[PDB]
């Protein structure tokens, strides 16, 4: 209701700078990579393959960004990118999302796994192998 919707821009901007700072923190922390992430080491202690933990890291970051996006549009209404800042944050979240579509990691890593699978994964061929 435009009648209602008019007097909230100040509070809106306060929330936008909050959203702003947190997505910026996501740029920072995601700009540090998973191999050097200490989260990799803790996740590794929790016993996952580094491949998995890496995409878990990625996918979770994606979920936080998506949650922020829904926060943004619930705050700024559905006409949201039409709004002065929403277009910007949209572009930024989209490019940030494009730097998170990790299917290539599974591709290339599945190729390395397949390369190893050519003669290792079913090595029961010598149940008690000589040595």
């Amino acid at each position: 209701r435009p009648h209602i919707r008019g007097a909230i821009r100040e509070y809106q901007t306060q929330l936008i700078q909050r959203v702003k700072d947190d997505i910026e923190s996501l740029h920072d922390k995601f700009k540090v990579q998973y191999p050097q992430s200490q989260a990799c080491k803790m996740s590794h202690v929790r016993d996952l393959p580094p491949v998995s933990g890496s995409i878990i890291w990625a996918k979770q970051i994606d979920r936080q960004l998506t949650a922020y996006m829904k926060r943004v549009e619930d705050v700024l209404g559905k006409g949201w990118e039409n709004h002065v800042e929403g277009q910007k944050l949209k572009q930024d979240g989209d490019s940030f999302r494009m730097k998170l579509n990790t299917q290539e990691i599974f591709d290339d890593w599945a190729r390395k796994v397949q390369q190893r699978n050519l003669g290792v994964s079913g090595r029961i061929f010598t149940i008690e192998s000589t040595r």
Partner: protein, 66 residues
């Protein structure tokens, strides 16, 4: 970028300030990464080579003075 680059011969012999400059420059580089431009690492190679030269030049100057 260039105000930092052209300022690399300004803050005389302070590693902290040098570090700060570089960090700011690559913050701009991630900005370049998001809205990906075309051949960004290539242009970064260029940058880094001239940065190395301004660095090594400020270095050798301070080396002699030290």
């Amino acid at each position: 970028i260039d105000l930092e680059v052209r300022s690399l011969e300004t803050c005389m012999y302070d590693h902290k300030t040098f570090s700060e400059i570089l960090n700011r420059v690559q913050k701009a580089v991630d900005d370049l990464n998001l809205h990906s431009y075309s051949n960004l690492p290539i242009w970064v190679n260029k940058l880094d080579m001239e940065i190395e030269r301004i660095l090594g030049v400020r270095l050798q100057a301070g080396l002699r003075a030290w």
